[PDB]
């Protein structure tokens, strides 16, 4: 339920490339999408362990394309070690070749509980909650999107901080706000999560 949504999100950015991500640092899924079907072999090497083969799964995506994914065994999802990946066509031709770290491909859930409010001040204050059922909230940095016209505004939020005070906003406009999250801890990394559920607010005038 949450995998397909996150997969589609990553598919939205670079649908052609090989996409790998973790959610809880105890899992890993790599998946790529092609035009409709070829046969492939998924292999990986972790640390000093010998090369292993992953049971590759396949399923069609609406608009008639096929998604090939491998869910690595939990025992082979260790962090801070090189994980070499190799996707080879049945012909022997090379499709993909990556070397990743599990802790550097984190994809969290979207932030929740976004609230917009005015300050006697005419300034807008945004408050939200970190992604649910996720440990180490203190090492999560955010990005809020401010949009009105036809036309946006992006603001970076430092790690651990779950609120933002916006100024220089146009008077009597309808603003809409959204916030996404990602790992910011020095030893970690990943990709921007999906945007949270948006909130709107009508600003006052001069």
């Amino acid at each position, epitope marked *: 339920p949450k995998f397909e949504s996150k997969a589609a999100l990553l598919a939205a950015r670079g649908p052609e490339e090989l996409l790998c991500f973790t959610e809880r640092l*105890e899992d890993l899924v790599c998946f790529w999408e092609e035009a409709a079907p070829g046969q492939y072999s998924f292999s990986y090497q972790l640390e000093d362990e010998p090369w292993k083969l992953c049971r590759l799964h396949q399923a069609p995506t609406a608009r008639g394309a096929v998604r090939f994914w491998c869910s690595l065994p939990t025992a082979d999802t260790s962090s801070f070690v090189p994980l070499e990946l190799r996707v080879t066509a049945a012909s022997g031709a090379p499709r993909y070749h990556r070397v990743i770290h599990i802790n550097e491909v984190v994809l969290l859930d979207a932030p929740v509980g976004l609230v917009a409010r005015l300050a006697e001040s005419g300034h807008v204050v945004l408050r939200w909650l970190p992604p649910p059922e996720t440990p180490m909230t203190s090492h999560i940095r955010y990005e809020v999107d401010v949009s009105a016209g036809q036309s946006v505004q992006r603001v970076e939020i430092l790690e651990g901080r779950t609120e933002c005070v916006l100024s220089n906003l146009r008077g009597r406009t309808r603003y809409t706000f959204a916030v996404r999250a990602r790992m910011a801890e020095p030893s970690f990394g990943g990709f921007w999560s999906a945007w949270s559920e948006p909130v709107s607010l009508l600003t006052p005038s001069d």
Partner: antibody
Amino acid sequence: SEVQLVESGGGLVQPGGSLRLSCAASGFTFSSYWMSWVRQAPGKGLEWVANIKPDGSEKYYVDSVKGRFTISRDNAKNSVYLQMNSLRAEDTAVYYCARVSRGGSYSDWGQGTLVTVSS
Amino acid sequence: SQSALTQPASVSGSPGQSITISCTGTSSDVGGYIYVSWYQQHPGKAPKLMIYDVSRRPSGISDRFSGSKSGNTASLTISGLQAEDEADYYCNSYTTLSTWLFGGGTKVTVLA
């Protein structure tokens, strides 16, 4: 088994003195692993001192060592280094060189080099 | 310095019996990550990795050694206790401060 870690550079030093430790690695792809220093005072427990990224772009230190110790590495020579300046008496310990592996665990250890700070 | 994870000073047991070593921290270290490991050290020798990722064993470690954790406390269990098991045991955990923290250490003694 094939992995080997050999520390060097220890010895006696006056308080405030300097000392540079070296750790020659072999048996694995050195440039793709975190490396670490762990020390152990005589009769006491293990204490983490410093970690360093495979490419050496990130470094972390235990609080009591910040500003005094510097961890570094040379991937071409398969070596880890620990520059220890302004040595204190409480820095007296056996310093181990360790390879960081799965989950950050220390899979391989050197035999350790003794550092003694006294007058 | 950063306070070491809390381990019992010493535990003892008869051969064949099972013993358990505790490792208590906070939700910011032991209970916050799966990056918990256990090490064994015989007198005059370098430490040896027994358990990593809370419950996983490296290649060549006896299945008599097992690891687990609940809440903010990790536990190392040694079944079928032997004379060779007499050593110091340390736990280790990643912390929110981007550091790694050892426990105080536990002296295991086997009585004949």
